[PDB]
């Protein structure tokens, strides 16, 4: 099998992921079956830990696997579903290496970094590039690797080794290595500068790699003389010296790789499959492209926040609304609110910002509430909800946010203002939602309802089973373990909120409409996760068609 | 408190481990309370996969801990008894590091190796040192930290890096570096070459140490223009610039360093307690050497093997002969002899073996029967101890040893013939020797009688209690489960083998000799590990007193 | 003697020198007597072959020493006069060490990099640092050396060596060392990147210098945690390590550096006789600093080029103008114009660049005119020159100015079109300027006037001699051949130019001024060379009087 190995040598923040990952998207594009590994130096075995502010969001797979946000981008520049094992981290490593230590089958041998551990990397790859990632049975052809970390850093160490063996193995024509690397220019002489270019290529054959293509970040187009320089250190052609200034779009990124022509030299070196076409699919993304960058109409809409400023709390959430968006043909504009402010006590006690927020809860024409765990904010975002259902404005509540959809209606509409949560409020009187975990055989203990689960619809009358396409069931990533009480759910059926979406085991009601309003629906899995640039999640989809007000023109 | 960190340079062979034992066994000499501690790059969280072939040996502490047999030199060269902890490894690092990611110790952080795992090493270190490890309260003074592999290696960076950082934790005046490495000669010019110091210099600097002492590995005494080379690469003086020649035994290399004067320096850098003082108890071990060197007379006696050739399979067992053979006045000659072929087959099947074997054991005017586990060879040992008793040779038989004299008495001399154990032979009719592993509460399942227990004498008769001092009870190191079943005792009771040692459960007998021979015993403990070169094991000095002869009047 | 060696990390554009230079600043107004040097790793010997273009201007010293534009900057920095050796380079140390192999003065042993170049820069740097600088005759306190190139490069290599030794021979309280290194922002996290700084100190140190300072380039003031973990990487505390964004002028640098403390650590490091006074002098530069960003006022006056844009070509030039400008307290336009499409050729064949320039020498209340080599632009110089006398602006020629201000008036003035230059037209029918080349014992052939030469003035008449103080003489630095002849001064005596100034041996007349205007002269010298920011040059200073017509008032 092919494979692509993506390495940095200056910083870590050159996006050798979005490098990585518009190989990949040009390698399908030539109608290539691509899968793609990523390697986190860190110790961490799985993304589970992960507190989202400092790391970001948590992804979450077809298998259940808790992994790394990272890997979400090549599940949207590629076609494709991960399993758990394309993340290899550092944790992963030693952890399996060390279990087979105790098996003892390494036949009581002493187990070093080499060759143990590099072989372990080295059967990992292998195994995982032969698993069949699309939705095509057939083994993929090429693996591309992204390698995190910069060259010279000692978490990067066993991987490096690992990688310089492994190209004798996999042969020649067979492996293929990127180095990304920063042409910085200063301010003044405004001159792209070579030298860590330089350093951090001598580093990598001070490893045991060589950079097959060379990828040079700068703020501003290439000069030819500064390539050449490149090239006379590092052996390579100007062709090979590709170059990425700061541009527009993520969308742009395998664009400016195409027109930097990288496809001619991986067949040439690669020998792929690729037979050569005079039009491929790639068109299409050009289109896509073009269109991006025509764009013009608004609306201002909302995103209820329990953090004090977005950086990754909300990635995959701002991308399915951008993939709707585009497909509205409109501009996004994501007016950040945090909720534990609107609240009474700090309404009181930080009046600049409570008058703040309800300024951006006006300007909302809709509004997005996302999920949430533990207590932060949980007493203020109800009131961008109630704000919603008595404004009639467009509505949509996700994880958390559905499961404050049902206890409000039971405070305001039912009267039932006992009501309340599990997790804030154990003491609660008539607890609404409650914790019900999934147990299994096998396990120990309740675990969380995670990964994809079938819902399935309880009637043809909603507006979600429209958007998803008349069809009967949906199969959706959870990530939770608090459901609304299925005893209370009788409470309901006279007054005009409705559950149309239940477990199969019908033990968990996973989806929620509210009547006589525009838009205004929550759900318990996570459907940020299922978009895709070329077709947003209907959810998502149906809040913006609302938000325009084109809603009630898509249905027909 | 003082550190004293010991690394080497060029390759992993110079014998950091005599150094650093070296300089503790002087400090100690200086009245210092000096604890040591290893640490093993190595993935192994402890010893006890270890096949002793491949690594070696496998060392047991008081606390039950299975080490590294580097970890018994320390032990040997200062009056210490370890805990499992001063052996630190990238295993236990590792593990003690991903242990703490499951608790949630990191507040959901990212774990990395910097900060995360060099913290890991500062806080063993530190603590490790604060423990007690003479039979002194009080806590010791300097702390002996070697660090295994080699400048450069991906295995030893986490701790090179993690010693960077706690030179500044520690202060200068408490942190110091030795550093080792190799000033080859060419067999034609002759001449000590300087190049490997240099660059494995810098590279430690380049890691971040910087050596406060050079050690310098040779076949023969230094070079002044040579040390003067050294110095002006490595900006140190000469007097820094320790060296060592090759030698005839490691007792001398602390007498080598104190003629290098390094203790005048460590009095310098590190502001010792050592008041000066004109004499010191150093005077004995110099008297010691001095008769080590003087020695003249031999007795031929065998060890019993079953590998095929010593490599160190028998390291302690030949240092504890070794250290009774001293305080005979004797040199010891191990005439090593494979029993896996004076056994029936292969005495037919490779005859020229089989008759170099009987003139081994024809030469040994005495015999030492060590341990063993699996089948190998454990048909042909009974043939050496059945030879011993019929020859009235003197004898010691340990662990397997024991148990393969408790099995030839019963089927010699008691015509038990029947008897065999249940390791070899699980099928057998009279089973003698039986797996009894030891249980106690918080363990699942039978587990093996490891580390020190207490051995109670039977009677006062025993030339073992006699050797031991006349004491009541001993405490001594075991690594088994098969014990002679306590069912089959009555049998003994008649003949002339006595059980002369017992548990303080009473559940098992650990100690046999033989009436009406010159000497003849056996023990289920390893007395090796508590042998010190000031002090034989009591067994091993009665299987010596009785080869010699010297035995009798010994006891007078 | 007291050493700062000034070196940079990861890129040479640091600005390197402007930390030298303001590190001397802030010592000698600490009251020390403070040299420097500057190593520059190129093979040329000398600046002499340099054209201005590709490195920039060349600089002279009082010794006739043609220099780097570098060392300039130390001379307007710190009150001091360089000799020829306080430039060191790779071309002199190798042709120093070369002439002593053939001397003999290496007795017959091999010539090698280590110990022999090495000793040389020793040698070189006690030698040169024992000279004094400044008009006192008492040896220099300290040494600032500042060595070009960056950590790493193969030209540093014999240097970086030699300071590795040298930090032995001076004192460790006698040598420092700072470091000067980038912590790149990306434009979009914003974040003062750390790695860069962390390699390139690893390959100091693996070079054997160690950094005493750390000097950090930024866009924007620096973050304490930022700082924090350089001070991890790099063994320093925060307040070692000093940060520099990029500012509005280099007379702001040594007012940074006092800001971040660098006085306390040099008093603390190097002991200094700084006795701790809570005024020094840097009151009067701290005023200076504040009144230059106050500035307001303008004028637009030209610079006369000959190539096609400014770099450095000027540089020294710019510097007088602005010395100038800011003694005026107004801020100075420099209007660049190409007179090489002045000139009709280029007039008629590029009418948009003859209409531009007219345009812009249209903006020119007032003129310099600077000097020349080759027949570059010769014929169009000529019309600024008649333009500015027929347009009655004020002007200054300098060198090639003033032997086309002499030729100009002959032409049109005199009537005697027929004469011109030796250097251009050598055929001419009345050579008006001749080659005339100094001639010396000692030396073989003619040779340039060149350095420092005392010019005499003729009469008290000059407003040159009053902006000069009305001394009688006046030495200033020269750098030609070609003169006045001067058999044809005889021509001038009747009209309205005039000879103000003559050699001492009276064979060449080296200043003139134009009566019946309001400031018009030339000068064979360079006053540019003399200049410094507390006190101007006089020619420059009378330009720009004249150009505000501050002129007749400043005389007053
Ligand atoms: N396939 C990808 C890759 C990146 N991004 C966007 O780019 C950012 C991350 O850029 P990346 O390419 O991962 O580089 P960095 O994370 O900046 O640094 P590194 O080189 O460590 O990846 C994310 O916010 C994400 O929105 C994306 O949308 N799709
Ligand atoms: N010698 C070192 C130093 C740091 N790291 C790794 O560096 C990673 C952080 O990457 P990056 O942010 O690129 O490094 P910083 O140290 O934060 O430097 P910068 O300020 O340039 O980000 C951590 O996971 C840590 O394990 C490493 O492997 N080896
Ligand atoms: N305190 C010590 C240290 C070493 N030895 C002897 O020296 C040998 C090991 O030498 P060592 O000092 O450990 O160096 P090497 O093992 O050769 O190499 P390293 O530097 O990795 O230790 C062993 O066979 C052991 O018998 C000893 O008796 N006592
Ligand atoms: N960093 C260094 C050190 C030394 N040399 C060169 O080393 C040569 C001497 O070679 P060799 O004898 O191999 O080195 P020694 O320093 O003498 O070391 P050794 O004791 O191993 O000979 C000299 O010409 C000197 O220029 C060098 O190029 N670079
Ligand atoms: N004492 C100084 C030093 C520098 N400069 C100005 O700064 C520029 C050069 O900056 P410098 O400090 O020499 O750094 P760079 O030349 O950019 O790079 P290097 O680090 O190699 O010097 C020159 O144009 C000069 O006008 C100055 O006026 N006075
Ligand atoms: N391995 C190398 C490469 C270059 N140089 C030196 O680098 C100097 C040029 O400095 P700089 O401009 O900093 O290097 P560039 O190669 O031009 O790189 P950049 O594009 O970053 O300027 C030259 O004098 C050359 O002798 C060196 O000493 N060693
Ligand atoms: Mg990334
Ligand atoms: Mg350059
Ligand atoms: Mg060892
Ligand atoms: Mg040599
Ligand atoms: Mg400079
Ligand atoms: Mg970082």
Same mark, same amino acid.
């Given at each position: ?6 390495? !940095? ?18 390698? $399908? ?44 981008? =090549?599940?949207?520049?590629?076609? +494709? ?9 550092? !944790?992963?490593? =030693? ?59 000692? /978490? ?14 996999? $042969? ?18 405004? /001159? ?37 320089? +490149? ?10 010296? +590709? ?19 990288? *496809? ?72 950040? +609110? ?8 700090? #309404? ?30 949980? /007493? !203020? ?22 499961? &404050? ?98 477990? *199969? ?8 409409? &509210? ?28 809040? &913006?068609?609302? #938000? ?9």
């Amino acid at each position: 099998m092919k494979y692509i190995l993506v390495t !940095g040598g200056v910083i870590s923040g050159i996006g050798k992921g979005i490098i990585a990952s518009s190989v990949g998207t040009i390698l $399908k594009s030539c109608g290539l079956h691509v899968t793609s590994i990523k390697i986190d130096p860190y110790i961490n075995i799985d993304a589970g830990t992960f507190s989202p502010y400092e790391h970001g969001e948590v992804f979450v797979l077809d298998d259940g696997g808790e992994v790394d946000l990272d890997l979400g981008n =090549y599940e949207r520049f590629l076609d +494709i579903r991960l399993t758990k094992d394309n993340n290899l981290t550092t !944790g992963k490593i =030693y952890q399996y290496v060390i279990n087979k230590e105790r098996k003892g089958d390494y036949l009581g041998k002493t187990v070093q970094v080499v060759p143990h551990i590099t072989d372990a990397i080295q059967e990992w790859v292998m195994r995982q590039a032969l698993i069949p990632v699309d939705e095509d049975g057939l083994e993929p052809q090429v693996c591309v690797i992204e390698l995190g970390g910069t060259v010279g850093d000692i /978490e990067s160490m066993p991987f490096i080794e690992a990688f310089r063996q492994f190209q004798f193995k996999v $042969k020649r024509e067979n492996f293929c290595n990127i180095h990304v690397s920063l042409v910085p220019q200063p301010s003044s002489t405004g /001159e792209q500068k070579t030298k860590p270019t330089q350093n951090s290529v001598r580093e990598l054959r001070g490893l045991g790699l060589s950079p097959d293509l060379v990828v040079c970040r700068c703020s501003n187009p290439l000069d030819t003389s500064v390539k050449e320089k +490149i090239s006379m250190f590092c052996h390579v052609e100007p062709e090979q010296v +590709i170059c990425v200034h700061d541009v527009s779009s993520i969308y742009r990124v395998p664009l400016l790789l195409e027109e930097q022509g990288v *496809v001619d030299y991986f067949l040439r070196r690669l020998d792929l499959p690729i037979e050569r076409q005079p039009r491929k699919m790639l068109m299409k993304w050009k289109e896509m492209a073009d269109r991006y960058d025509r764009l013009l109409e608004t609306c201002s809409i909302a995103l209820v926040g329990k953090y004090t400023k977005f950086s990754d709390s909300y990635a995959s959430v701002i991308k399915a609304l951008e993939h709707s968006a585009l497909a509205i043909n409109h501009k996004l504009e994501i007016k950040y +609110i945090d909720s534990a402010d609107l609240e009474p006590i700090t #309404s009181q006690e930080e009046p600049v910002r409570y008058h703040e927020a309800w300024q951006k809860l006006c300007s909302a024409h809709g509004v997005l509430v996302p999920g949430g765990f533990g207590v932060r904010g949980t /007493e !203020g975002k109800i009131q961008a909800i109630a704000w919603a259902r008595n404004q009639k404005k467009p509505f949509l509540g996700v994880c958390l946010g559905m499961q &404050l959809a049902v206890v409000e209606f039971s405070r305001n509409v039912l009267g039932w203002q006992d009501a309340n949560s599990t997790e804030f409020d154990p003491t609660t009187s008539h607890p609404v939602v409650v914790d019900m975990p999934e147990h299994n055989p096998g396990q120990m203990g309740g675990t969380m309802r995670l990964g994809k689960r079938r819902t399935l619809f309880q009637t043809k009358n909603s507006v979600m089973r429209k958007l998803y396409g008349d069809a009967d069931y949906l199969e959706e990533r959870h990530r939770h373990r608090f459901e609304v009480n299925p005893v209370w759910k009788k409470c309901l059926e006279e007054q005009g909120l409705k559950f149309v979406g239940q477990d *199969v085991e019908g033990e968990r009601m996973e989806i929620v409409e &509210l009547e006589d309003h525009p838009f205004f629906v929550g759900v318990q899995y996570h459907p940020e996760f299922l978009s895709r640039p070329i077709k947003p999640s209907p959810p998502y989809f149906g809040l &913006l068609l609302a #938000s325009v007000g084109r809603l009630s023109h898509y249905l027909q």
